[PDB]
Design a protein around this ligand. Structure first.
Ligand code: 3PE
Ligand code: 3PE
Ligand code: 3PE
Ligand code: 3PE
Ligand code: 3PE
Ligand code: 3PE
Ligand code: PLC
Ligand code: PLC
Ligand code: PLC
Lengths: 506, 80, 90, 205, 75, 158, 491
């Protein structure tokens, strides 16, 4: 349904006249295609039947209940992202018309969802390399979709080079595996899981570690995320980790058969180093996207401890964490795409150049959001409080579940560092909350009419004029209450994760 | 010798020189696969090599397209 | 009304039965509070004698003073965690 | 009769008396010192060739300068690691097994030897504060059980029958002490006295 | 089971009520909005309870096998 | 009693003397805060805020609540700790000590004579007190022998 | 009933207050009726909810049985088992009582946004009140850490000149340490597969593993009841937080750490609590002596009371770790008595003086007993109560805690008696200076204590002297509950 509709959108888009209304309407055709895909997927795919694991397409693709969880999650998060490009994020024509200037935006996104959803299912080194390129090529194109922008093109060039080296490392590990065994199917390799150099699978992981931005490779991800348009950074900083971390978990599932300790020490060396950089790095930053880039690295460090431990509680910790972290990430970026309407306008010093690609770029552009919109400020406060790990939000249960998996497997050193690194990172999450509210009472009664939102035309002066569009507001509210009120249905959700199996059985 | 990272001395100082090093690096992977496949008399390794050559070509085209638009973006006055 | 103590020992029950274990803890607490109540009664007898005897308080209050100084170390609340979690026989 | 203080230590693989064949403290440090010297020395010359190829370029010299090691560092670093590996192994033989205080002692001194070479123009107090700081990190890294507890993890104990998979019972008292991760309903009183000692409410008043 | 969908619907009313504040509009604005947001989450709430009841049936059967495996381990 | 025109009198009386920084019959209801429309509520703001403008820490809006809602809560707390039929553990242990004397000394006529004639109110003051009651037998019986089974609960010895 | 009525009503109240205030935001400027008199209607609804919260618990206090051993009023709400025993009931009563007083203290001394303040105060009180009635470590931790989100915002929004430093202190000190309490809670869930209080009370762990869990938990406790050397957050936060935030942060938040010992250390880690009790005494005796001496050299008025809070809490920890009923009952009565005297002083120092002169430096205030006599009567009266004068509820708590300390350890536990002398040094020096010599030449004659500020003082003094004269009100509830905490085998 995804592939067939993609061809129809490719042909149709190249026929009709270049205009914003038609570009925005085609973006609403893709929102249907992704919705239709989820209905067909959930219809045939069930947890109860995919438990054993089912080979598809001459064993090239293997699907089980652990992979199947993430495909539905990926489809869901791709619906919430397409809602941004398909509806108004602000309603001001100047800021919004950027999302509709490109007709191939939705096509490239639909290309990536095919790439993302097939990566966890791969079961052959021949198709592992092909699928990882299909996902990797789609990201470079999306990073350069705004080809007029100098920073966007400079980022895609940086992205392509780093990913090309990353893909070469992945390709070289598979070749080395084929050299030793002569087999391509992953199941056939499992028969020789004790007879092959287990470090050649680690060389495979080193390639997948680059693509998720893990230190010492973290440098490029921070640069890329702080240069792309905020609508682009909202996608490329979350989606690759959804499908690669699922793949990394499976590869580590096979690896722990021989339980090689040297493999675990090197990965612990990278997890430990990344927590240090992910925490101390964000202390001295001014750009919000650079801040969320360091925040992303720290959460990936937590999620690797659940992957590295790889027990029965590690499935629960990973499955829960990857879901709550995606909703938190969408909620935060959606707010940053909206609160740009409250920016002031000059009528000077420090010569800060703002562009239509990142209207909100600095942390102090969040100033006085407690005054301009109190309800959305709390939503950003609740979201940041989840990242801090304050209970009983979603973020606490992610760290609590990760700690169970980590300590149950003897990772005492990493468990303590993650709890040190969490507190160090609380400093720079607290700065976002300091900027949001702390200067409320001095600014309470101010004469503000130079905001960007004050350039909106007055329609009637009799009817009520809401400040924020309908769809984006409903998404922000829904994900803010889900983050806040997870305590109500937490027991059902966690018991719904006990059933996700990866060859546990009995 | 290469443990001191000698190959960094062998890569030129232009973005196009990096692109070539990526191709020469991947070329080594394909040659390794052709070597194993022929010794084993296995055509599955030759299917892999054929895919690697085709996939390594698509990677070049996208990289050059980004580089080409990167170049014209500076030379974009065009006010004549 | 006056609830009767559930006279029960830690040495005859299964701690897996947390209902019976509760009674073994409640029964060991109630007996100890009786000893303090017994102790406070004995001390009252000492006080009358000393006030009434005056100079002869060393004689007319001899065994009460002896007994009170004997019951004092052990007629105090000690809880049940000591005996529940420890095995004197071993 | 000594005092009774708590023992907050994660379990370790105990080596039987007669086990633990020691390892050559000279040879082990020789490999790290010589090896690290060639790598750091070799990478320096390699980075010098990159300097010759490009000098006027701002970005290339921007990155090459970060990795550059001063002439003291190219000498101080190999000595410190060689000193670190010698002192870490040597203290392992003295203790008949690696301990946190041995790793603290090796790391702090080795840092002091190293820091005094490539950080001469700083007060000696400033170095000792840094060396003691770096000592703590290796003390805590060893105390935490290296990167992983390994066989002493609860998962390993559970997979070996030494976990609480078997429940608890009051009628089954174990004369010997229970394992690190194991829990019991009731304990032999002699284990309490051998831990708490007689006195403040144990046995006597 | 209607009370379970009652709670889910009341959560639907809260989201629409919380949407008004973000948009900065009076809470009586467009009263049909609260019906749509309520019914949307009752549809979600209806399915969510179906999913959890399905989990109970699956988890009871899996635990039947896990108990047997533990007994073999505890031999 | 919103009295829309009562504001216009305040409006007119103020309007006649526009100079600023140079009454009792005003009292709203809960209806005027919510039911009333903005325009009629709009004028009320100016009258009330600027009435103070032309100016001893009394009638601050709390005395009606705390003196009616908070203080009776304390009386309810103070009452409960005074006249509640909660039996503390030690007061139970005193009645239980005597209830065992009756059960353990049923052959003793004189002992039961003092327990019988005793009232349930004076159980808590056995010994020297203002009450003219006889308890020498009660005190004497406890002294001679113990009436607890603390060793009876402990079936394990060193 | 209880928790279900306590959450659902408060959530309904919070929603009601938000609906009323934010209705008029819209696209147009609003001059509504609810803003008139400084949000007075919205402050009243906040004050009523505080009073109603007390009525909910009393409905369940009547049913409480003092002769039953075990948790009562057990109920399950949100897949969490709750309940009340003797110790928890009284602390819940203290927490909810400070509700109306914290709100009343800030009635007309904030520059605005009273509705936000009123919601936060009732939110913090409920979170702390619910923390005494849960029955598992995980739920204890959830409520133990959830109070940071409102408290950090409240101190930052409404704080004094250094509110940014104070906000960055409470958030990080009480999170970087309580995360160590999360580790020991997690390990309980890994080996035992449950964190319920009753289930984990019956398990004995290896004496090595007992030492690890104790060190983790006591790290999280030594910060909440600030023990030297990790006390540096409390003096700073007190001197900068709003007055109502100081009443809760001193009245209740510190006592959550003494209740942390009662649930998390004594029952389940009983063997290792005996070992650490000598070490706990060393830390607390040095906390008692150093905090008293440091107070002698302070200048900020509201800091001076902050350090007096640390000296008393050190005595409370000394008593609770004594293995007898005398020390445990004394420690808990002191926590209740300190729960009224400590907030009263901040009203006198940061709520009556600071609302008139807006300066906390001690140098400006002397001879205050001339033109402010009613203030100086309460400052004198509360100075004595703060220092264990025999008729107050603090003396009963301190004497028993000292008595229990000597019983547990006659030699070093006797040094607790230095609390009687040192508490009179820094305190009486502060009172003697304030109400002595001629009236200050830097201040100007103004109103004496207002009628509202008298109401706050009288109802923090009245509970203090009832517990002093007749402490058996507290004891009759505690005795059977506090007797389950004692670990001793006598043969
Ligand atoms: C919109 C959210 C739609 C939720 C749809 C989820 C779903 O239908 O599948 C749930 C899936 C369980 O499915 P399964 O166990 O495989 O078997 C049953 C299949 N018939 O359960 C899963 O494992 C899926 C894991 C991802 C779940 C993400 C949680 C949903 C987040 C809700 C976002 C709501 C945003 C607000 C929408 C506003 C719309 C304008
Ligand atoms: C014809 C020869 C051509 C030239 C050959 C020399 C090439 C120059 C490169 C320097 C030589 C050292 C590195 C050589 C390969 C790495 C060493 C290795 O592979 O391990 C072998 C050696 C010990 O091996 P062994 O324990 O005896 O194995 C048998 C066990 N029964 O392991 C060793 O300990 C050897 C010494 C290595 C220690 C140096 C590194 C220690 C840490 C310093 C940091 C180096 C840079 C850090 C970069 C990390 C980046 C994240
Ligand atoms: C052998 C080749 C040379 C060594 C290469 C090492 C590669 C592995 C490093 C992993 C992290 C990659 C860091 C990025 C590359 C850094 C390269 C570098 O050294 O640049 C120098 C930089 C500072 O440059 P600067 O000193 O100001 O200028 C020198 C003037 N000649 O110095 C730095 O910024 C380096 C510090 C970056 C952050 C590293 C800290 C990682 C955390 C380690 C501590 C973990 C503590 C955890 C506690 C428990 C464990 C003890
Ligand atoms: C209108 C009808 C409301 C829904 C009625 C219902 O479906 O019953 C569910 C529950 C009733 O309780 P019950 O089923 O007996 O067992 C406890 C489960 N909560 O009632 C409920 O579950 C409603 C509780 C939701 C409101 C509380 C939300 C909690 C917010 C966080 C509190 C902070 C905790 C830390
Ligand atoms: C402003 C006031 C501030 C607070 C007040 C400060 C004082 C409080 C602390 C001191 C407490 C009183 C002194 C403690 C000892 C008194 C009790 C005693 O008699 O100890 C005797 C005991 C054993 O007695 P003995 O028979 O002689 O030993 C042989 C046993 N077969 O054991 C002994 O032998 C004890 C030996 C002498 C005591 C040594 C320790 C005394 C305290 C020194 C603290 C220095 C500061
Ligand atoms: C600004 C501050 C404002 C507040 C200041 C408050 C000061 C008021 C002083 C009183 C303080 C409260 C104490 C009175 C209330 C408690 C009374 C009580 O508990 O009596 C218990 C006593 C024994 O109990 P029981 O025999 O079992 O039967 C009683 C059933 N309720 O039952 C009895 O038979 C006792 C009968 C009462 C005896 C007289 C009580 C007088 C209390 C005041 C004097 C206290 C003792 C003297 C202290 C002065 C210094 C020496
Ligand atoms: C401005 C406002 C501020 C906030 C005010 C507070 C609002 C409180 C609303 C009360 C609602 C109510 O009562 O919910 C009751 C209902 C139904 O409960 P039940 O039938 O018993 O189901 C069982 C519940 N157990 C376990 C308590 C018995 O649960 C809900 O819908 C839960 C809320 C949704 C949480 C998100 C999880 C689902 C999405 C999964 C993706 C990760
Ligand atoms: C018992 C637990 C229930 C759960 C409560 C969840 C909070 C969400 C409330 C949203 C309502 C709203 O956004 O409304 C805003 C209200 C009232 O603002 P105001 O002063 O009237 O308006 C101001 C503007 N004016 C005056 C110009 C009109 O302030 C609050 O939010 C206060 C409570 C939340 C603060 C801390 C949030 C931390 C969350 C994490 C906790 C673990
Ligand atoms: C406070 C820490 C108390 C332990 C000190 C200790 O373990 O004591 C001193 C240690 C170990 O010394 P050792 O020689 O291994 O001890 C005795 C060796 N035996 C058994 C062979 C005789 O030294 C160190 O540098 C320890 C580094 C401190 C790490 C702090 C981590 C805190 C995390 C808390 C998790 C809940």
């Amino acid at each position: 349904m995804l592939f067939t509709s993609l061809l129809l959108i490719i042909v149709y888009g190249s026929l009709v006249n270049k205009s914003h209304l038609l570009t925005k309407l085609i973006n609403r055709l893709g929102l249907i295609i992704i919705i239709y895909t989820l209905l067909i997927h959930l219809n045939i795919n069930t947890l109860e039947n995919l438990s054993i694991g089912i080979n598809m397409f001459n064993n090239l693709l293997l699907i089980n209940s652990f992979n199947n969880t993430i495909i539905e999650l990926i489809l869901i998060i791709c619906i919430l992202y397409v809602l941004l490009i398909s509806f108004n994020i602000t309603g001001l024509s100047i800021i919004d018309n950027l999302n509709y200037s490109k007709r191939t935006f939705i096509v490239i996104v639909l290309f990536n969802i095919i790439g993302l959803t097939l990566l966890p299912l791969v079961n052959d080194i021949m198709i592992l390399f092909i699928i990882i390129e299909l996902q990797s090529y789609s990201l470079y194109l999306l990073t350069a979709i705004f080809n007029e922008s100098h920073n966007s093109t400079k980022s895609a060039l940086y992205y392509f080079i780093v990913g090309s080296i990353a893909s070469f490392i992945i390709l070289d590990a598979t070749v080395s595996i084929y050299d030793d065994l002569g087999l391509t199917n992953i199941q056939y390799i499992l028969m020789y899981i004790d007879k092959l150099e287990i470090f050649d699978l680690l060389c495979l992981l080193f390639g997948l570690f680059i693509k998720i931005g893990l230190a010492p490779f973290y440098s490029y991800s921070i640069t890329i995320y702080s240069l792309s348009p905020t609508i682009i950074t909202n996608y490329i900083s979350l989606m690759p980790k959804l499908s690669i971390l699922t793949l990394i978990y499976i590869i580590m599932h096979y690896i722990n058969i021989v339980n090689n300790t040297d493999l675990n020490y090197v990965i612990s060396f990278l997890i430990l180093i990344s927590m240090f950089i992910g925490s101390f790095g964000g202390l001295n930053v001014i750009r919000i996207k650079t801040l969320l880039a360091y925040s992303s690295l720290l959460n990936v460090s937590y999620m690797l401890l659940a992957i590295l431990s790889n027990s029965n509680e590690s499935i629960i910790a990973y499955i829960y964490y990857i879901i709550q972290y995606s909703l938190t990430h969408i909620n935060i970026f959606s707010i940053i795409l909206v609160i740009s309407i409250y920016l002031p306008i000059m009528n000077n010093m420090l010569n800060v150049m703002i562009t239509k690609y990142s209207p909100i770029e600095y942390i102090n552009q969040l100033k006085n959001l407690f005054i301009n919109n109190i309800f959305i400020a709390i939503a950003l406060c609740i979201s940041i409080f989840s990242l801090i790990g304050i209970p009983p939000l979603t973020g606490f249960y992610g760290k609590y579940l990760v700690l169970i998996s980590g300590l149950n497997n003897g990772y005492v050193l990493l468990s303590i560092v993650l709890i040190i690194a969490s507190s160090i990172s609380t400093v720079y999450y607290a700065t976002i909350l300091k900027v949001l509210s702390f200067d409320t009472l001095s600014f309470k009664d101010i004469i503000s009419n130079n905001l960007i939102i004050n350039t909106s035309p007055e329609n009637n002066n009799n009817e009520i004029k809401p400040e924020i569009s309908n769809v984006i507001s409903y998404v922000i509210s829904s994900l803010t209450l889900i983050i806040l009120l997870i305590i109500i249905q937490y027991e059902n959700i966690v018991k719904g994760a006990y059933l996700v199996l990866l060859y546990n059985w009995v | 010798m290469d443990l001191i990272l000698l190959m960094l001395v062998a890569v030129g100082l232009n973005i196009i020189d990096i692109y070539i090093m990526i191709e020469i690096l991947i070329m080594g992977c394909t040659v390794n696969t052709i070597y194993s496949a022929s010794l084993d008399n296995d055509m599955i390794g030759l299917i892999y090599s054929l895919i690697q050559i085709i996939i390594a070509g698509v990677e070049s085209a996208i990289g050059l397209s980004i580089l080409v638009n990167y170049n014209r973006i500076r030379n974009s006055e065009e006010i004549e | 009304d006056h609830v009767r103590s559930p006279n029960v020992s830690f040495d005859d029950i299964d701690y897996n039965n947390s209902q019976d274990l509760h009674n073994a803890q409640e029964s060991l607490l109630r007996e100890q509070w009786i000893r303090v109540s017994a102790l406070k009664v004995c001390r009252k007898a000492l006080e009358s004698c000393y006030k009434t005897s005056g100079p002869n308080h060393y004689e007319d209050c001899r065994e009460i003073a002896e007994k009170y100084l004997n019951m004092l170390p052990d007629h105090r609340i000690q809880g049940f965690l000591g005996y529940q979690k420890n095995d004197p026989s071993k | 009769e000594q005092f009774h203080l708590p023992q907050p230590f994660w379990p370790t693989t105990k080596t039987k008396e007669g086990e633990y064949v020691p390892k050559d403290s000279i040879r082990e440090a020789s490999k790290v010192f010589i090896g690290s010297g060639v790598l750091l020395g070799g990478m320096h010359f390699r980075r010098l060739m990159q300097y010759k190829k490009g000098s006027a370029r701002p970005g290339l010299a921007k990155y090459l300068n970060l990795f550059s090691l001063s002439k003291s560092q190219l000498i101080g670093f190999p000595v410190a690691l060689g000193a670190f590996s010698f002192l870490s192994h040597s203290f392992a033989n003295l203790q008949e097994g690696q301990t946190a205080t041995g790793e603290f002692a090796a790391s702090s001194i080795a840092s002091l030897i190293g820091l005094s070479i490539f950080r001469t123009k700083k007060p000696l107090s400033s170095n000792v504060a840094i060396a003691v700081g770096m000592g703590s990190l290796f003390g805590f890294l060893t105390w935490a059980g290296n990167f992983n507890l390994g066989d002493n993890s609860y998962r390993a104990a559970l997979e070996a029958g030494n976990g609480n998979e078997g429940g608890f019972d009051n009628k089954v008292i174990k004369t010997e002490r229970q394992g690190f991760w194991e829990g019991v309903y009731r304990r032999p009183l002699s284990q309490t006295v051998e831990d708490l000692g007689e006195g403040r409410g144990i046995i006597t008043q | 089971m209607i009370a379970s969908l009652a709670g889910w619907g009341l959560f639907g009313v809260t989201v629409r009520a919380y949407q008004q504040g973000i948009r900065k509009v009076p809470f009586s604005y467009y009263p049909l909005g609260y019906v749509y947001s309520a019914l949307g989450w009752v549809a979600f709430g209806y399915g969510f309870n179906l999913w959890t009841e399905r989990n109970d049936k699956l988890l009871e059967k899996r635990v039947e096998k896990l108990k047997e495996s533990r007994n073999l381990r505890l031999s | 009693a919103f009295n829309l025109q009562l504001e216009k009198e305040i409006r007119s009386k103020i309007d006649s003397l526009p100079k600023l920084n140079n009454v009792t019959n005003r009292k709203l209801s809960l209806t005027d805060y919510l039911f009333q429309n903005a325009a009629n509520q709009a004028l009320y703001v100016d009258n009330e805020a600027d009435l103070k403008e032309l100016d001893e820490n009394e009638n601050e809006g709390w005395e009606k609540i705390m003196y009616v809602g908070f203080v009776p809560t304390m009386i309810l707390i103070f009452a409960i700790v005074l006249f509640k039929d909660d039996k503390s553990i030690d007061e139970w242990a005193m009645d239980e000590l005597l209830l065992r004397l009756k059960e353990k000394n049923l052959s003793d006529v004189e002992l039961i004579d003092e327990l019988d004639k005793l009232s349930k109110s004076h159980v808590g003051k056995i010994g020297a007190s203002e009450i003219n009651k006889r308890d020498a037998v009660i005190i004497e019986r406890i002294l001679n022998g113990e009436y607890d089974q603390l060793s009876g609960l402990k079936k394990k010895e060193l | 009933m209880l928790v279900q009525n306590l959450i659902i009503f408060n959530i309904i109240g919070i929603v009601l207050l938000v609906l009323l205030n934010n209705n008029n935001n819209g696209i147009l400027n609003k001059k509504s009726l609810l803003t008139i008199k400084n949000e007075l209607k919205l402050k009243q609804i906040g004050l009523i909810i505080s009073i109603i919260n007390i009525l909910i618990i009393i409905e369940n206090w009547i049913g409480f049985n003092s002769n039953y051993y075990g948790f009562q009023n057990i109920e399950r709400f949100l897949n969490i088992y709750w309940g009340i025993d003797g110790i928890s009931l009284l602390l819940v009563l203290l927490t909810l009582i400070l509700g109306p007083i914290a709100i009343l203290s800030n009635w007309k001394n904030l520059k605005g946004y009273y509705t936000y303040y009123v919601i936060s105060i009732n939110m913090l009180v409920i979170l702390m009140a619910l923390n005494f009635i849960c029955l598992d470590l995980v739920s204890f931790y959830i409520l133990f850490e959830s109070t940071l989100a409102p408290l950090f915002l409240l101190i930052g929004i409404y704080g004094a000149n250094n509110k940014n430093k104070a906000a960055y202190y409470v958030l990080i000190y009480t999170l970087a340490s309580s995360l160590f309490m999360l580790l020991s809670i997690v390990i309980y869930y890994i080996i035992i597969n449950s964190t319920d209080y009753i289930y984990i009370n019956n398990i004995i762990l290896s004496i090595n593993l007992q030492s690890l869990l104790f060190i983790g938990i006591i790290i999280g406790i030594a910060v909440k009841t600030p023990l030297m050397p990790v006390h540096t957050w409390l003096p700073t936060v007190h001197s900068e937080s709003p007055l109502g935030g100081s009443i809760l942060l001193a009245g209740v938040i510190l006592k959550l750490a003494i209740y942390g010992v009662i649930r998390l250390l004594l029952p389940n880690l009983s063997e290792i609590s005996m070992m650490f009790t000598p070490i706990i005494y060393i830390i607390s005796i040095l906390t008692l002596i150093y905090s008293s001496l440091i107070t002698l050299k302070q200048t900020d008025l509201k800091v001076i009371i902050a350090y007096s809070s640390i000296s008393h809490l050190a005595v409370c920890m000394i008593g609770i770790f004594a293995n007898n009923l005398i020390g445990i009952n004394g420690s808990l009565i002191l926590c209740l008595a300190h729960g009224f005297v400590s907030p009263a002083l901040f009203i006198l120092v940061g709520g009556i003086l600071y609302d008139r002169y807006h300066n906390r430096l001690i140098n400006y205030y002397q001879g205050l007993s001339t033109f402010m006599p009613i203030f100086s009567i309460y400052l004198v009266v509360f100075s004595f109560c703060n220092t264990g004068t025999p008729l107050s509820g603090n003396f009963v708590g301190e004497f028993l805690s000292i008595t229990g300390a000597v019983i547990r350890h006659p030699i070093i536990g006797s040094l607790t008696a230095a609390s009687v002398l040192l508490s009179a040094c820094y305190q009486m020096k502060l009172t003697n200076r304030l109400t002595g010599s001629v009236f200050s030449q830097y201040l100007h004659i103004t109103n004496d204590v207002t009628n509202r500020e008298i109401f706050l003082l009288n109802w923090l003094l009245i509970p203090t002297i009832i517990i002093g004269i007749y402490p058996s009100f507290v004891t009759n509830i505690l005795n059977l509950a506090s007797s389950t905490l004692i670990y001793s085998v006598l043969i």
